[PDB]
Design a protein around this ligand. Sequence first.
Ligand SMILES: Nc1nc2c(ncn2COCCO)c(=O)[nH]1
Ligand SMILES: Nc1nc2c(ncn2COCCO)c(=O)[nH]1
Ligand SMILES: Nc1nc2c(ncn2COCCO)c(=O)[nH]1
Ligand SMILES: Nc1nc2c(ncn2COCCO)c(=O)[nH]1
Ligand SMILES: Nc1nc2c(ncn2COCCO)c(=O)[nH]1
Ligand SMILES: Nc1nc2c(ncn2COCCO)c(=O)[nH]1
Lengths: 237, 237, 237, 237, 237, 237
Amino acid sequence: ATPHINAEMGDFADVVLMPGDPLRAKYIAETFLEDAREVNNVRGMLGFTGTYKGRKISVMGHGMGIPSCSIYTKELITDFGVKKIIRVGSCGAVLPHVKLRDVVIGMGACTDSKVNRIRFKDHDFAAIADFDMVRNAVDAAKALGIDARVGNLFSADLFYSPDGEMFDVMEKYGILGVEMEAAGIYGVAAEFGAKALTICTVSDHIRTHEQTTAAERQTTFNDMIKIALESVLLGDK
Amino acid sequence: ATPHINAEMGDFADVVLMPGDPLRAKYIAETFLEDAREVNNVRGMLGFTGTYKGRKISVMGHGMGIPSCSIYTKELITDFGVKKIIRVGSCGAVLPHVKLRDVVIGMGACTDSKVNRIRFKDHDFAAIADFDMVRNAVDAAKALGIDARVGNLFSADLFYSPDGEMFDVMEKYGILGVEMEAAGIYGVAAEFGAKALTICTVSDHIRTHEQTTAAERQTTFNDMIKIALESVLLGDK
Amino acid sequence: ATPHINAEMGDFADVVLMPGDPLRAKYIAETFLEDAREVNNVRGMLGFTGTYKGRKISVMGHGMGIPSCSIYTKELITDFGVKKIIRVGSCGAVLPHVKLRDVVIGMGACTDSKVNRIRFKDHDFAAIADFDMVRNAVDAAKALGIDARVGNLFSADLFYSPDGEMFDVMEKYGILGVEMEAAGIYGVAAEFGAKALTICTVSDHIRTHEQTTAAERQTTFNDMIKIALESVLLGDK
Amino acid sequence: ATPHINAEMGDFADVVLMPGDPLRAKYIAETFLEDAREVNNVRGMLGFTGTYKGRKISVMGHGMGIPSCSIYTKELITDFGVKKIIRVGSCGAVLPHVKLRDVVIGMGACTDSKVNRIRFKDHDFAAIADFDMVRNAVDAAKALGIDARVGNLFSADLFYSPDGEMFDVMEKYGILGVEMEAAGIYGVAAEFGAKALTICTVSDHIRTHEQTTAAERQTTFNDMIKIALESVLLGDK
Amino acid sequence: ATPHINAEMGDFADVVLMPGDPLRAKYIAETFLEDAREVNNVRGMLGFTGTYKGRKISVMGHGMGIPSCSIYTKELITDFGVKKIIRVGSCGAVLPHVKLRDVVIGMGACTDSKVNRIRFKDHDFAAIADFDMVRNAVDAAKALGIDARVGNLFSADLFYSPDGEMFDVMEKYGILGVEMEAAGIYGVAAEFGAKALTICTVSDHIRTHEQTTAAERQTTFNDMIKIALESVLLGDK
Amino acid sequence: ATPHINAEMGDFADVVLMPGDPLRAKYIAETFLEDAREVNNVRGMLGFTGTYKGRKISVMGHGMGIPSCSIYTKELITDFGVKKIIRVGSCGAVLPHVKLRDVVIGMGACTDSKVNRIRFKDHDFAAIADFDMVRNAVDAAKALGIDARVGNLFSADLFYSPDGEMFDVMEKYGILGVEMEAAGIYGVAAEFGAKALTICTVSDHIRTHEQTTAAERQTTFNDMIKIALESVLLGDK
Ligand SMILES: Nc1nc2c(ncn2COCCO)c(=O)[nH]1
Ligand SMILES: Nc1nc2c(ncn2COCCO)c(=O)[nH]1
Ligand SMILES: Nc1nc2c(ncn2COCCO)c(=O)[nH]1
Ligand SMILES: Nc1nc2c(ncn2COCCO)c(=O)[nH]1
Ligand SMILES: Nc1nc2c(ncn2COCCO)c(=O)[nH]1
Ligand SMILES: Nc1nc2c(ncn2COCCO)c(=O)[nH]1
């Protein structure tokens, strides 16, 4: 057991899907995993382990923000033998060509957090995904008929930013999605020697846009999770 | 409703107690509040409203880390008419004279987060509590026979810090407790014109120490919550 | 003697009031202290010691700016047995509701200086006053019929600021007054293990217009000094 | 013509290979391109254009360092219709498992430069390659029987580093190679809307000893260039 | 009249010598000038105007630290038509071969203050003296047969520095003397369009606590003042 | 031999002139030296040793940017006994009264590079030329009847800057010319214990795109080279 995960070595798979919302983790275990077992309830951060087409997989919430996901991803890697982390989340879009419900794969993650500067003697650490995990996700997406965009995320510390003009800078430099975690997760992965990917679904456009139905949101969420789960299987080959 | 709180104006009191763990919020509502009603379940971030000696009070989890609590505290202030936030949490101690189970009241909060630099044109924002809220808490504590320490907290972005030497610096400059929120909460309070306090209970000593029993932990947790609730009543006079 | 104070252990009380202006130190000694003797004149930075209602008290100028007041407060603390510093100064207001001749007590002090960053490994140190000293001052002011405002000061390095967009930021984040010392003094106090407080009168409204008073000013100035001295008596018990 | 390239629209292919050394640009043109013509000689920064298996391709030196390669890559992109830049360089290894003559592909590039901070409002920009270009390179290398390592480079401003404690940090965080350009090139590509990739061969092991090879070196260098050119053909479809 | 100088346009010469100590400004007025009249005593910051071999010259204390001297130098430039400022101060040596009582001429000034960063968008402003003023002081010192070193001062905010290791860095980079003003004065001269120079004499070693007497200290204090005044005469031709 | 210079101890003079363009190093060797022999051509960075009125003098390109010239200047100092470096380059003007073809002498160099911050614990290192070298160049220019301004250069990392507003700041603070090297050269000279100066001629205005011809540009290019070489002769006496 670790201070935030009441479990023991072997309760988690070597791959963990992590949505921000622990209620989404439960949904994932019910909908996609066979023979599922609850492995964590500390602080209501529900975590599960089961199988997907024979492959042992875990899914657990990480909570909002770099500091929250940095705790869980760290403890998973150092105490539970976890090798790959796939964040499966939502993000806001700044580019007009990026649409609601697009699947974005974060090969890199910009951030306004200081955590990687603390790690890296105040220089620029390029917070990146594991490349094979990126390609696995792109290929899984293509096999399912979904055309994912690959590029930079921006991991924001402040959801309610006082710096509105920063969204124009994000747009200018090609940022595909704004979320709150990737750069933190990629930093932990590099610190402790494991591998990470963040896949996000565009749930907001910080420009116009219109909005979507609950049936549409569920479909793309399911698509994202299919992409994550199938990407793991490609990775094992 | 706000993107993280499915509720409407008047569902929350103008004062909200916020532990990090939403399961502790439920415990608080059951143990101390009368006529309690659940007002939030979005992402499992359980929130409640009831009364304590006649006074309308709410209690809701904020999750770990500045970015998480910054979302909830912001939405509470701007959309739910909340005026005072009392964080009620745990912290690690660096000073040898500060003991397990001490109640620490954060008149200020140091941080290694960048959020207040983003707010404050990269200068030093002294993240502080509201003074009356501090004194209310000190007086409530004294009336209950608990002798609280008042001073600086340190709000860390990284629970698992790669910068071990920073704990010696914290010790040198008098930091009473290490937690993950206060500076963020105090920043939001200043940004949006409300008032905040963080009270913490020492649950770890990052030096020796020994440890405690579950009965002892529950007692001091209850003491902290009594201090928070009674402080509110002094504040209304 | 230290390189900036030509005096010996015992020549100062264990509490020192400190205006910026050494001429105002003489004003204070002469007006409020009995049996007042001059104890320093190096660089014209007049210091005095006498009694206020039987209690040994010193008053000495600190000069303008963090680097100046950091020298004097340090040497007082480490070489003259001084345990409490009370800065008694002027400040400029940025908030509309803060008026000329309001007494403001600096519970915390923001700054654009780098001194606390140098001390605190480039993180945010919340430069705060001693809590008991703050509440002694509030109570001493209440006994005199004055309602002191307690909150954040801003300690500026540049009196003539290159750009005044920073005043709008100070105003947004609730800064009560702008002066040039508090954050430095609170830093020294934490570095060297003593207690400090800054009390200021509002001399100027940098916002507006700036409609003026008489003197009047001088009676409000005397009220600040009386608050300081009476707060010391409260602190003694 | 631009201030650093004496050539006209059409003189370059829409893809440019770029070594640091202009003498190596001539090596590449001469060895790998048919019908190769020199298209630039301003400041001795030789550029050439010819064909590789019927495909129009250019190769031109960029000089050592971010500021040098930022000039050439920008002018190529905005004035010569260039859509893809492939840096083909050397780098120093810090990881034990990374050997002399490993081909490393810079999916991301860390840096101690300030150029991306200047672009990105002092936040962390993750300087990344174009994903498709990265996977074209990996596949081109696999077809040639080479197992390219994909990960982070470090783009240093100081070849002769003031202190080498930074190499241990690079090693802890999984940096595959140290060179002087990639982060700058990836920044320009994102600023001006083009695509870029850095491929390097390991010329040195800054860690150890550093036991040596023959040339051999030169055949691994030719493999890098063949990977680059073949990746372009894959990218064309 | 300005907020810190009770005097009028004409009371000061167009050149002002400024020691930190106002009492040394007095000694200079007594010892070197004739028809010396006091033109300022606000806050005890004594200023004098007189003549040196018939040349109108002023001399006024600036207080300790960047913020203090920035106030007085600014006011002198904007409201009293002062064109040139010559600081005549003490400094500490960090180089073993710079001996007590050496005269140092600050052609540049390093600093750990943030004031020039605030002026210069957080980039490196090289805080430099006026070249002709530097040349004049080198020639005045030659003509009087006095040894004088030209190079970098370091202007510190903390006389009592918590970072002793920084002195090794100053040593490493050839810093001739550590004082508390020059970089601030040179930034003010640049901002408000005047000219400045800092001359200092080494009154101790940071490393040691080495010994002299009141005969030599004043004769060397007098050497610096002669250089300064004679350098002005040369500037006039 | 060093990694970027194929030559041996003795092949260079103790003084080296360095333009950025190696082809201008060639023109200088042809036009001004006698018995000129090529001593370096690695990476095409042409270096020549010869004599000027019997004085042994070398001249070698340094490439564009701080990182490039830091490599070559370091190697020259540590392995070829070079004592003095004189950069002879072009710059852009930001002051309207600094005209095309003006000669500028960089007594100091501002920068937006991080290299000196890395050397100087993130404080402000005033990057300065050697005073005697500056004096020699002022006197050489006087004796040849050439106008020459002394003050601050700004050494930029981005020739193509995304922050146009910074040019207004450079203007505000008297920056005489914008180039890409001086601050880096002056930092190298300080770190490795040699002497340096940067002289430049203004080849355009950042603001405008103003016009000249090949007759005047070379005659002014020649003016700067004469100053540099004659300044060395003066230094020898
Ligand atoms: N900052 C930010 N984070 C987001 C957005 N959408 C999703 N995330 C990341 O999820 C955490 C917030 O619910 C957005 O629009 N902005
Ligand atoms: N960084 C840190 N945060 C703590 C500690 N104890 C409590 N907190 C704050 O609570 C969030 C982590 O569970 C501690 O020891 N270190
Ligand atoms: N920076 C600043 N300092 C002040 C102000 N008012 C008083 N002080 C303190 O400086 C005292 C010297 O005038 C103000 O408006 N700004
Ligand atoms: N900074 C750095 N650059 C390198 C290294 N190896 C190759 N390069 C790229 O510089 C090419 C010029 O030698 C290295 O070990 N460090
Ligand atoms: N910071 C610093 N300043 C000095 C020293 N010596 C002289 N000065 C100049 O100002 C300090 C006045 O006491 C020193 O040793 N350190
Ligand atoms: N950054 C910059 N450098 C210049 C300019 N003019 C000359 N230099 C010196 O190096 C640039 C060579 O093209 C300019 O306008 N900007």
